[PDB]
A paper describes a structure:
In our structures, CydC and CydD form a heterodimer with each subunit composed of one transmembrane domain (TMD) and one nucleotide-binding domain (NBD).
The rest of the Linking Loop then connects directly with β2, forming a new “Linking-β2 Loop” which passes through the front side of NBD and covers the ATP-binding site. In the NBD of MsCydD, the β1–β2 hairpin becomes really short by deleting a fragment containing the A-loop, so that the distance between the adenosine group of ATP and the tip of hairpin (Ala315) is 21 Å. To rescue the function of NBD, the adenosine ring of ATP is stabilized by the sidechain of Arg85 from ICL1 located between TM2 and TM3. The TM3–TM4 pair, TM5–TM6 pair and TM1 of MsCydC all move away from the center of the helix bundle. In the ATP-bound structures, the two axial His residues are 12.9 Å far away from each other in MsCydDC (or 12.7 Å in EcCydDC).
Residue numbers in the entry:
A (entry chain C): -5 to 509
B (entry chain A): 4 to 507
């Protein structure tokens, strides 16, 4: 652990200092004598080298342990932040993402100096310094009592510096999150800016953000280096004070020579660990504030959900607020103006957020009490824009799990005529968001992912978008066939072919929660 | 080397200045000055103030040591400030140059990499490049200069021994960086390739959380995040260890050389010439301090060579297939077009070809045509700033008029800050139809003589889609008189007007 390795290091340092002081004392008192047996110059060097090697080995072991522990802790914290943020309501997720992303990617990595050079430094300062003081007092108590007078100053200086840098740490963290988020957003919108011709105007704002970040970092650095210089001067003056004292007491012959060398060699050992702690504190501050932000993000209560499970088969979904009942085996079309909680109604039926209009009941039992894990296993949901990550077409078809019957679903939806026209088949690379495929082909890929799956309830948010008349008819025929196969289908189309394709139409109106 | 593409890449993006590099090297050389001068003025009770009482000598020695310490501390503070300022300037320049390179390339090339890869390459890689500037350039130039000067100086006292000393110093300062680099490179490649997979799955979980949650694939993404974090940690430890031992070996070499030098300096060295002691305390100390600094420089060399390789592979990706050629369409200043066809025919391709023909490549600053693609971006900024991405000199009255005439007057009236609402999430803060209307308002606010719209009435209302499309294709409803409007649509009414350029 920290204790054993730090004890070994402190003991080795103290013993090396004492041994060196004694040998220089022996050589001074015996300038040209003692050669040819018990030289006190040959056999002491081997002990000094052995102590140095032991100290190096202990430092290596401590570093390995610290690195492993830091990796484990950072991984656990990142997992906590990801599991907390991503499993919340979509509005809260969109609110606090691009801030959880920063602390997860570039923020929590700053905790490595905290575990690999700050905590060991603190432990070594707590161990070696009293031990060095005790050994110096045993050899020459006057020197130790004289040095203990400069000791309390350095902790007070550390307290002042920490009080004055705590806020700058958080300011730098916020600047970093803002810069990363804005850069990602600007890169995401390069095609739009190039289409409108204003592509070269975003480089300027990127430059302003980068300059701001550089200025903040330079300010902090300046403060840190000034603090390090002040600590170095403090320790050097504290050492020189006792150096003067012992030198004066040695010139007039009041003290023994070996005790003087021992005190002079053990004086810097009192103050070195404090300088190391002061240097490590500034390095660890960024990780400290990133971790504090990470726990702030993670510490948020999520609404609880019950363990109720819907019975086997296609259930019945009722929304009494709109007098809507979606029976199994029939297609129900949700229509209304642009903004009356239709996609929100779908997401409330899923259970991702609260219902815009009254309570939602699935087979009697309320949605809020349903076991979400098991409930989502009986659903197939197709949002407005299906997820299409960079990669191949085959990788995107398997993004949301496997498709049992990919060929038949592709034939029914019409995606087989898309794979055929691609020169590489289902292996063509795709860009971000589906670049490399057209909007109708992206919609058909999403429809293949959604329609072909083991599910009893189908939720589709305008499924026939970007499709011409023939493809619209084919897709609606496939949806109607799936409904005829004993499933609950809830379309959110508001066009004539979609409306005249369902056995029930709900005309959900405004003044529900938001317009 | 000069023809290395990585070298040219880091020379452009990380553009340095010779003045700061020379200043840092001079500051290091001057920091060696106190090391030279600790014993260069008060060797014994001879050199300084001839002969003096012991207490006077003690006081002089203490004050000289403290003054030298103060000077070294101030010099180190200045050198650290200069080096870190240079690193920050280089990092900012590299980030700006990377974004400019991305924005100058065709837009489909910027969409090849995921968000996690973009984060991993625009953060730590740029930091590593700035680190290579500072840490690669300073100790190395210092070691080379110090070693060459020391060998040249010692070639006079004993050239036969000068050859041996040069051989030993070169052997040490070559084998230690060689071991450091050979340990660092292979492990750091794996570490980088694991780091730019940990955050890919971990930003995928953040942007698309609800879909993965409903599909039951979020636990897998988080598991991949954890696994790649573990792999990166092991790779970093494997990088660290042998570099540590290879850097520790110079320290033992330094100790042995110092002890041997002192022992040789207690053998008739004060005789003949006392400055031989100063030379003997100057040469090994500086040379071996530089040798001890070298292994970290070699490790930084390898790390940022990997980083620069990643950056270059980000800047220039392999192109995808080319969109099919389309028939040229003649346009008139005031015409209305209704390009139609099936869902794979190439209406968007024809719109872009028409825009390219009208713009006539570069050299035509007044851009004649602009394509408003259906998947256009909604930024995470205010509504006014979202609308001003097209025309930056539009007053709020014009913005409000456009919003009211595209059907978003009631939406804007209900916004907490009106035109200053932040729209957190971009397209996630609005609804499909509202986003479509916002894009139509963007098109309306524009000042382009030719406006090419791509499926502008998608996700719109039943009672507003047909009227909006007819107004778009009416020569006086939304775009008036001298504006050409080309609309690629899927819902053209059966009974209507204006020419059709249907595809196949
Ligand atoms: N963070 C948010 N995410 C989604 N909708 C939001 C958010 N904040 C406010 N809203 C508002 O929620 C309301 C409901 O939008 P919703 O997407 O549920 O409607 P819709 O019926 O699907 O309409 P559309 O025809 O546009 O798809 C809109 O007024 C929208 O602007
Ligand atoms: N980089 C690319 N981005 C998009 N489509 C591409 C690209 N390269 C080739 N294509 C192909 O070009 C063809 C025409 O696509 P385009 O987007 O022009 O069609 P569209 O008529 O607009 O169809 P839709 O109505 O589905 O949008 C398609 O086969 C498409 O996959
Ligand atoms: Mg919607
Ligand atoms: Mg298109």
């Amino acid at each position: 652990s920290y204790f054993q390795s730090n004890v070994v290091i402190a003991g080795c340092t103290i013993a090396s200092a004492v041994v060196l002081a004694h040998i220089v004392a022996g050589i001074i008192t015996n300038p040209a004598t003692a050669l040819g047996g018990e030289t006190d110059w040959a056999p002491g060097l081997v002990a000094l080298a052995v102590l140095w090697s032991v100290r190096v080995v202990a430092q290596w072991f401590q570093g390995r342990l610290s690195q492993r522990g830091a990796t484990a802790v950072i991984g656990e914290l990142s997992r906590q932040v990801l599991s907390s943020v991503t499993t919340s309501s979509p509005r809260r997720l969109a609110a606090d993402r691009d801030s959880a992303a920063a602390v997860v990617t570039r923020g929590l990595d700053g905790l490595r100096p905290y575990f690999t050079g700050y905590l060991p430094a603190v432990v070594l300062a707590g161990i070696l310094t009293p031990a060095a003081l005790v050994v110096m007092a045993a050899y020459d108590w006057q020197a130790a009592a004289i040095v203990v007078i400069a000791l309390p100053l350095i902790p007070i200086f550390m307290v002042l510096i920490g009080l004055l840098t705590a806020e700058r740490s958080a300011a730098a963290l916020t600047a970093m999150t803002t810069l990363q988020g804005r850069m990602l957003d600007l890169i995401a919108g390069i095609p739009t800016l190039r289409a409108v011709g204003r592509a070269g105007g975003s480089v300027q704002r990127i430059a302003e953000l980068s300059a701001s970040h550089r200025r903040s970092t330079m300010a902090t650095l300046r403060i840190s280096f000034l603090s390090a210089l002040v600590l170095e001067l403090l320790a050097t003056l504290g050492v020189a004070l006792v150096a003067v004292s012992v030198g004066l007491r040695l010139v007039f012959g009041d003290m023994t020579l070996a005790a003087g060398l021992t005190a002079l060699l053990l004086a810097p050992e009192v103050f070195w660990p404090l300088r190391r702690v002061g240097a490590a504190f500034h390095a660890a501050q960024d990780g400290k504030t990133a971790a504090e932000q990470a726990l702030r993000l993670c510490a948020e209560p999520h609404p609880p959900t019950g363990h109720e499970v819907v019975p086997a088969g296609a259930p019945v979904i009722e929304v009494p607020a709109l007098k809507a009942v979606m029976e199994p085996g029939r297609v129900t079309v949700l229509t209304g103006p642009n903004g009356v909680g239709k996609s929100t109604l779908l997401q409330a039926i899923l259970g991702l957020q609260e219902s815009p209009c009254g309570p939602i009941l699935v087979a009697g039992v309320e949605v809020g009490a349903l076991d979400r894990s098991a409930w989502w296993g009986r659903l197939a949901w197709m949002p407005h824009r299906p997820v299409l990550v960079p990669g191949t077409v085959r990788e995107n078809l398997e993004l949301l799990g496997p498709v049992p019957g990919l060929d038949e679903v592709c034939r029914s939806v019409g995606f087989d005529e898309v794979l055929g026209e691609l020169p590489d088949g289902s292996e063509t690379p795709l860009g971000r968001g589906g670049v490399g495929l057209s909007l109708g082909q992206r919609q058909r890929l999403g429809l293949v992912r959604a329609l072909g799956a083991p599910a009893d309830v189908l939720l589709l948010d305008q499924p026939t978008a970007h499709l011409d008349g023939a493809l619209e008819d084919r897709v609606l025929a496939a949806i109607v066939a799936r409904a005829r196969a004993g499933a609950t289908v809830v379309m959110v189309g508001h066009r004539a072919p979609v409306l005249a394709a369902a056995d029930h139409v709900v005309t959900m109106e405004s003044s529900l929660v938001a317009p | 080397l000069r023809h290395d593409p990585l070298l040219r890449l880091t020379l452009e993006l990380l553009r340095p200045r010779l003045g700061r590099f020379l200043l840092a090297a001079a500051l290091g050389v001057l920091s060696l000055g106190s090391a030279l001068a600790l014993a260069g003025i008060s060797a014994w009770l001879i050199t300084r103030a001839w002969q003096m009482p012991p207490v006077l000598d003690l006081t002089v020695a203490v004050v000289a040591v403290r003054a030298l310490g103060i000077s070294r501390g101030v010099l180190g503070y200045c050198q650290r400030l200069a080096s870190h300022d240079s690193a920050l300037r280089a990092a900012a320049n590299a980030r700006t140059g990377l974004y400019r390179k991305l924005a100058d390339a065709p837009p489909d090339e910027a969409m090849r990499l995921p968000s996690g890869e973009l984060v991993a390459r625009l953060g730590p890689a740029v930091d590593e490049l700035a680190d290579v500037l500072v840490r690669a350039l300073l100790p190395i130039v210092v070691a080379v200069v110090l070693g060459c000067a020391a060998v040249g100086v010692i070639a006079v006292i004993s050239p036969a021994s000068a050859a041996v000393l040069a051989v030993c110093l070169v052997v040490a300062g070559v084998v230690a960086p060689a071991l450091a680099a050979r340990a660092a490179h292979a492990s750091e490649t794996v570490a980088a390739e694991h780091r730019s997979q940990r955050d890919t799955a971990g930003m995928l979980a953040l942007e698309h959380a609800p879909e993965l949650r409903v599909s039951g694939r979020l636990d897998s993404v988080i598991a991949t995040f954890e696994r790649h974090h573990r792999a990166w940690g092991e790779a970093a430890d494997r990088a660290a260890a042998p570099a540590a031992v290879a850097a520790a070996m110079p320290t033992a070499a330094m100790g042995v050389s110092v002890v041997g030098a002192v022992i040789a300096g207690i053998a008739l060295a004060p005789t003949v010439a006392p400055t031989t002691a100063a030379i003997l305390m100057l040469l090994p100390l500086s040379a071996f301090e530089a040798t001890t600094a070298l292994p970290d420089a070699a490790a930084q060399l390898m790390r940022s060579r990997v980083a620069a390789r990643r950056l270059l592979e980000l800047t220039t990706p392999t192109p995808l297939r080319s969109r099919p050629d389309v028939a040229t369409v003649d346009l008139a200043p005031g015409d209305r077009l209704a390009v139609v066809g099936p869902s794979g025919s190439g209406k968007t391709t024809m719109l872009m070809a028409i825009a390219d023909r009208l713009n006539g490549a570069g050299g035509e600053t007044p851009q004649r045509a602009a394509v408003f693609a259906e998947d256009a971006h909604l930024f995470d900024t205010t509504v006014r700033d979202n609308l001003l991405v097209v025309r930056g000199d539009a007053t709020d009255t014009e913005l409000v008029a456009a919003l009211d005439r595209v059907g978003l007057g009631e939406w804007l009236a209900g916004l907490p800050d009106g035109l200053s609402t932040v729209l957190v999430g971009g397209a996630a803060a609005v609804s499909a139809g509202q986003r479509r209307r916002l894009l139509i308002a963007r098109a309306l606010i524009s000042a382009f003589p030719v406006v090419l719209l791509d499926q502008p009435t998608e996700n719109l209302d039943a009672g507003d889609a047909r009227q909006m499309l007819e107004g778009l294709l009416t020569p006086g409803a939304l775009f008036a008189a001298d504006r050409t409007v080309v609309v690629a649509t899927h819902h053209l009414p059966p009974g209507f007007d204006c020419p059709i350029v249907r595809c196949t």
